[PDB]
């Protein structure tokens, strides 16, 4: 692990609860859509924070309007663990804030291919 360059993963967002404590991460797929996990248990009261590097710049605290939790998600098996969040106010896209592409249903990321993961290591489960 290592420190990312400031504004290098511009789709990376933090999910803070009403109290302002980072509980989960997220990915901007559009100006008003964020994708995250279902086990996070995201609420309408939670907020999405974009343009963040140092958790401790031009950040955007965005409000959540609609929460689309996958209806096939059970906490026992933890299958279909995904949630899509429609933002109330859209994110102002800039140098440090922008979206990530989503793959097709037919696309494949096979074993051995080097991918990247980012965040502040805060796990819910």
């Amino acid at each position: 692990g290592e420190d990312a360059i400031p504004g290098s993963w511009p789709w990376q967002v933090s999910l803070q609860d009403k109290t302002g404590f980072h509980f989960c991460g997220g990915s901007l797929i559009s100006e008003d859509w964020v994708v995250t996990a279902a086990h996070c248990g995201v609420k309408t009261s939670d907020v999405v924070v974009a343009g963040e590097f140092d958790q401790g710049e031009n950040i955007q605290v965005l409000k959540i309007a609609q929460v689309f939790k996958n209806p096939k998600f059970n906490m026992f098996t933890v299958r279909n663990d995904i949630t899509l969040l429609k933002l109330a106010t859209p994110a102002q896209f800039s140098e440090t804030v922008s979206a990530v592409c989503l793959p097709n249903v037919d696309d494949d990321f096979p074993p051995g291919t080097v991918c990247a993961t980012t965040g502040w290591g805060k796990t819910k489960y």
Partner: protein, 93 residues
């Protein structure tokens, strides 16, 4: 507590290699990834697992479980996005 945004390059691992690590908990809607030693631990719950598909970063997985502690060397389990895209497309339109 990492104050700054962390990153880590990790490989995808096969279902068979992930199944021997866990067992019946792994299913077709879960992508595994991690050649461990502090790599999958950087991602938050619901964080991105991004892969370069034709010169552009694509969301392959979403952090689900397995990446709880950096000390454990088992593969990290992510939500296979491609398998969940049919559900995703239904609400985005």
């Amino acid at each position: 507590t990492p104050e700054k945004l962390q990153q880590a390059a990790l490989p995808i691992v096969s279902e068979a290699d992930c199944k021997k690590s866990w067992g019946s908990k792994i299913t077709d809607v879960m992508t595994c990834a991690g050649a461990s030693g502090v790599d999958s631990c950087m991602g938050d719950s619901g964080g991105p697992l991004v892969c370069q598909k034709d010169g552009v970063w694509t969301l392959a997985g979403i952090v689900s479980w397995g990446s709880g502690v950096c000390s454990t060397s088992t593969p990290g389990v992510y939500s296979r996005v491609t398998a969940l895209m049919p559900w995703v497309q239904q609400i985005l339109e």
